[PDB]
Amino acid sequence: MELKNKKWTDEEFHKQREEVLQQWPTGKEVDLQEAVDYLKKIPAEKNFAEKLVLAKKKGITMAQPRAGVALLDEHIELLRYLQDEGGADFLPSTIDAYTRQNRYDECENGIKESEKAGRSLLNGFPGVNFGVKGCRKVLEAVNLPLQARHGTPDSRLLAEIIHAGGWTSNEGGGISYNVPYAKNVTIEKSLLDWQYCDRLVGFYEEQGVHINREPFGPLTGTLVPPSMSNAVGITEALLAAEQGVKNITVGYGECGNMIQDIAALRCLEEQTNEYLKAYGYNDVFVTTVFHQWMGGFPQDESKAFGVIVTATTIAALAGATKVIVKTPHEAIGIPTKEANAAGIKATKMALNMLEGQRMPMSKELETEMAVIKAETKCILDKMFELGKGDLAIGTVKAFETGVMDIPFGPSKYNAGKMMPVRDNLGCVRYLEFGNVPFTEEIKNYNRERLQERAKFEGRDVSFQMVIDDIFAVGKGRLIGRPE
Amino acid sequence: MELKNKKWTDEEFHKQREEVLQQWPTGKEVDLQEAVDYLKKIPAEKNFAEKLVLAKKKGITMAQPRAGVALLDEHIELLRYLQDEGGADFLPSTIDAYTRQNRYDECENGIKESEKAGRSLLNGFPGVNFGVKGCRKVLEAVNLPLQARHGTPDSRLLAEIIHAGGWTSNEGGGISYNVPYAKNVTIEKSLLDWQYCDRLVGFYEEQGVHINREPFGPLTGTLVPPSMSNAVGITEALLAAEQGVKNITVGYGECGNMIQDIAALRCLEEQTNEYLKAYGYNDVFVTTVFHQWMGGFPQDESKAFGVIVTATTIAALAGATKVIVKTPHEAIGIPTKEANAAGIKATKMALNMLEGQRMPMSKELETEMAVIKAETKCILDKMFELGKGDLAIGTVKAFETGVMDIPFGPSKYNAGKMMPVRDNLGCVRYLEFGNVPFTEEIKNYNRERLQERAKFEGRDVSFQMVIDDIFAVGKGRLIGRPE
Amino acid sequence: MEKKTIVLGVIGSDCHAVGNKILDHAFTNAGFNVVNIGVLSPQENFIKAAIETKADAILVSSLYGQGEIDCKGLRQKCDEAGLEGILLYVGGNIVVGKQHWPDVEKRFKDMGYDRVYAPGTPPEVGIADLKKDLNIE
Amino acid sequence: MEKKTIVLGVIGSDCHAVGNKILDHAFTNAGFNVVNIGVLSPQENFIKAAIETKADAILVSSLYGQGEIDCKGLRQKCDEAGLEGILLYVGGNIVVGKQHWPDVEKRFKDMGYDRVYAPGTPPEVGIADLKKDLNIE
Numbered sequence A, B: 001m002e003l004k005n006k007k008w009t010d011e012e013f014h015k016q017r018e019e020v021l022q023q024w025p026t027g028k029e030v031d032l033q034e035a036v037d038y039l040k041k042i043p044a045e046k047n048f049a050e051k052l053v054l055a056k057k058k059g060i061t062m063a064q065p066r067a068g069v070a071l072l073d074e075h076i077e078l079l080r081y082l083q084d085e086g087g088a089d090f091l092p093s094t095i096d097a098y099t100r101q102n103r104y105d106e107c108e109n110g111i112k113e114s115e116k117a118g119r120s121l122l123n124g125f126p127g128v129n130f131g132v133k134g135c136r137k138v139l140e141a142v143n144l145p146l147q148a149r150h151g152t153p154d155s156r157l158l159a160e161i162i163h164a165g166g167w168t169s170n171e172g173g174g175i176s177y178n179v180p181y182a183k184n185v186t187i188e189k190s191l192l193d194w195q196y197c198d199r200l201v202g203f204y205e206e207q208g209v210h211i212n213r214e215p216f217g218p219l220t221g222t223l224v225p226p227s228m229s230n231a232v233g234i235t236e237a238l239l240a241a242e243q244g245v246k247n248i249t250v251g252y253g254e255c256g257n258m259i260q261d262i263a264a265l266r267c268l269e270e271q272t273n274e275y276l277k278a279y280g281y282n283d284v285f286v287t288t289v290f291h292q293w294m295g296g297f298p299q300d301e302s303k304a305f306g307v308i309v310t311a312t313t314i315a316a317l318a319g320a321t322k323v324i325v326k327t328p329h330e331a332i333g334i335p336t337k338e339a340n341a342a343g344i345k346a347t348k349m350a351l352n353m354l355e356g357q358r359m360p361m362s363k364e365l366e367t368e369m370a371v372i373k374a375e376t377k378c379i380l381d382k383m384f385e386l387g388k389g390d391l392a393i394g395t396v397k398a399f400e401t402g403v404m405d406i407p408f409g410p411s412k413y414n415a416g417k418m419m420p421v422r423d424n425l426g427c428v429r430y431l432e433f434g435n436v437p438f439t440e441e442i443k444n445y446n447r448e449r450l451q452e453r454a455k456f457e458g459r460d461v462s463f464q465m466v467i468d469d470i471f472a473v474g475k476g477r478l479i480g481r482p483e
Numbered sequence C, D: 001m002e003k004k005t006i007v008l009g010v011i012g013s014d015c016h017a018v019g020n021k022i023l024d025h026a027f028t029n030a031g032f033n034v035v036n037i038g039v040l041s042p043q044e045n046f047i048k049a050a051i052e053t054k055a056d057a058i059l060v061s062s063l064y065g066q067g068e069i070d071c072k073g074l075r076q077k078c079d080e081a082g083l084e085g086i087l088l089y090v091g092g093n094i095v096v097g098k099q100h101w102p103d104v105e106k107r108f109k110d111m112g113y114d115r116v117y118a119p120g121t122p123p124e125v126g127i128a129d130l131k132k133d134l135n136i137e
Ligand code: B12
Pocket: A094, A095, A096, A097, A100, A123, A124, A151, A180, A181, A219, A220, A221, A222, A294, A295, A296, A297, A298, A329, A330, A331, A332, A333, A334, A335, A408, A409, A410, A470, D013, D014, D015, D016, D017, D018, D019, D020, D022, D023, D059, D060, D061, D062, D063, D064, D065, D066, D089, D090, D091, D092, D093, D094, D095, D096, D097, D098, D117, D119, D120, D121, D122, D123, D125, D126, D127
């Protein structure tokens, strides 16, 4: 197929569907006519899109963990624990990494090994292998909405199965579930395959079935400048809306400076709404998700709580619709159900200690929001120019030319030229600009911010600072200070 | 002695000293000549006053736990752990409650019983009984400054012993170590007895020895409005300065609304400096301490961390010089050294995650500060009016007439008329004013704020709401909402 | 519920007052005559109040941790006072630190307390136990 | 010494890339020739690169947890490839979840790994072990 930012026709989509469902025998379990009626019978309390609307109406931040294991009963047991003992507002199912690479043969092997070992040897739930019948068992066993959380460049079959499975949200997008999660996949092909996932939600919404979509904001979770991360989310929201998506959660990964973070999340929500409306998408319901610190954690569990709850406080004060919970086991391995519920309990307690509180406007905040929107607009403007009005083509070309460039992405289609580093107050800034198309004024403000750190630490700003920042939180602080 | 807000003469103070030192045989270990030379040999790194000056200069928040047990070696081992494994910046020694009531006989029994049992049966360190020799062994075993933390209406002997013992800060004051901590001590007597403690620091300062004093801000720890708490600390700062105190940490207990809390700490610091200067004390070095949530804690340890770390974030953004650390054992009992190091590590991580960050000014903040300063001025103004210019006499009369009224204080000299309650954003407000001398405009604003709560919860504001608020945090949230 | 009298206080050198206020409120609201002797109360004050008011029970609150010391002996003084079989309850945060609760309950029951309560005990629990114990549910 | 060569990669279906960038930089700075095959690397890519570059050691990073599956068998393919005696290192977050480390270490040594590293291992440790093992300290 040729890539264009245009809604796929019904015939186009069906033709692709018949090919996708053949990629694993559980594809045979997907019946759209049957799935629509199943979906319509799920109570509103278990519909992710409808519960987001309620949370926005109530002014509350909802808490959602990450969770998944190889075997079906164990996976349900785990979700039930997070629900019941954790107090989760939303439930995930975290998909294993073989699934994410479309290796269902390896999924099956790992299911077998997990059965023998009595513990999960997969780092997540093999949804394709468990099929629609398994994903339905999961939904039926819990009392909260379910979302597929993962990181899959070609997610078409997974999406068909989890949504027919009654899972009413799908996370991801053609940039955010490519560049952080892949090496060899072109940006053209991941955008085409994510148009499928979005078009599938479009179909369901045309039938009156409401299903949330959530672009993955934090990307590599490693010093991503807010303006670069927001440009990706806004892009993914626009490309989703063109295929008919109506309920979108845009996301942002904590950088650590509270004002920068709140500015980023507000700019993200505002510019996303602004762009959708500017391009004629006038019926899209937009929510926000704040992810707690997605870089390296401290191994000490008490220090991990220091990270989890300061992150939550930022989320709370930002007015985030949703916050994704980290656990005291983050530095070490996939959390036990206990460690996970500790994360959720700590998180929800912080939220409840901050009920209705918001960060008030300040000059400091105003200034930072203006920086982030201008930066973001530089990028987006360039993308539209390169695509000659077509944002999907513009994205392909932006990656080809370093206009969009994600720090530390493994994708060979990512330039890897732009270098981020923190300033003296811990805000993430641009150290090296690469081909990111900023004006001199924007570039000079980043340099000015960064010189204040050089002066204070008595060393030139440098890649060594970057490495220090990569290690800082695991070593007990935000900023990679010398010694 | 007659109570007047006037520095004691050397002769007056010496006469009192010869009386005080006879109250327990350890008083014979106090030699002021020898003690000044001992104190001057303490390195600056172990002097509480000096280190606070350093912290102010660096714009960092320092973390201090609470801690104390009955036996000397055990006590030392505990503090060393908190220093080494916890990372504390200042060390306490929390005095047991028998000492606080001057029952050294019971201390002694408790020391023997603890030896026999292999664990502390006292809820603190009996400094009078351990004497100057023991207090010095504590100091010599650690590498951080030491402070006596307690709640003692008649602290004169204690103060002579811990200061001669090399501890370079004493917490307390004539109001704050009476009303939350005693039932039958007149305000006149505790003001007089705290004049002694202040006067002793004054002596030491006259000799070139720097010693910190810290009025106890949180009082009963139970919904104390910022303006009532701040009036008490400002007063104790003024009364200490009159006796020659030169290094003063004023304190505030978290109420839980971040803007109210940061407004409260800034108003406290600013009005303390203003009042000191207006009354001619021009060489007083003032710092602030923020106490993490002093009300009932949740029993679950993960939720406890939610409270500990949210509280720290507020302290951090407030620019508190010091933060007092709570532990995950708070709801249950005196923390083990491990629970305590956990609280300190979580706290210090949060601080380090927020390095250099401050709440920027906003309209909301300026409005709250204006309310707080105004309320506080109303009270102080009346106090000076009642004392005909003498704030100490005015304090006694304020308590007699209920101009100053501390919620839930056990003191029978406390009116018990004023009643606090939270508003719809969790700010602590005045529900019943009793004899607190506010203008109608000030009362009206409190009423307006509370009505928003009534509207939202569907019930009139009431003492039932007060009870709900007293239990709310232990049941998982800041505001006692219906259910 | 049929009216009965209890003495309520906080023992020894303990000044915690908020729980006392709430316990008074809740027990009063449940139909008891609460004789509240308040904070910082030695054994003798509880006993005096019980006799003067012919109390059915004595509820000893101890929050500060030293109640393991302060609570020893009350049953004996009550017997010497002519209060044999009076109900003796103890609750709050009655020992120093987190301890294995079955150990603590046995320690205080061996001391002569009828009922021993762990941290965070709701008033309603003691109200139910007290009604049952006085055969007035 | 004499520029020693290592193959460095991330095994299996694992896409984590930051550790890899840092390991590359640190070992390069310590004087090694780093042949970095990058992420999502199957066993056969480690072996091919080790053959072509006559590598002295293969450093297998595994962060995503399924390394316990993925890592099985490398030693035998290496021998079958004519790389008997090659040094094989494995580290990162090599099992799913928090586990008792001596048990984990044992399991991978049993797989034929010369050295096995726990979460949070500083590259300097691997650099010191590798210089020792290659007798170039
Ligand atoms: C950043 C991050 C990500 C980013 C990665 C972006 C990218 N492409 O690089 C994103 C958000 C995309 C992500 C994704 C996922 N992640 Co991740 N991630 C992390 C995180 C938070 C920090 C990793 C990091 O970069 N650290 C900084 C670098 C410098 O250090 P490092 O990677 O630890 O490597 C150092 C050391 O380990 C050591 N080292 C490593 N290898 C070797 C080898 C030798 C021989 C030696 C001497 C030393 C050594 O030296 C390195 C350099 O200093 C960790 C948790 C943590 N550490 O707090 C989880 C973590 C590694 N992620 C994890 C998982 C589960 C996933 C996913 C696989 C989820 C899933 N179910 O599919 C996906 C990836 C999909 C895939 N196909 O693999 C788990 C692994 C769980 C386990 N083993 O039990 C972790 C531990 C989190 C957790 N607790 O669950 N993640």
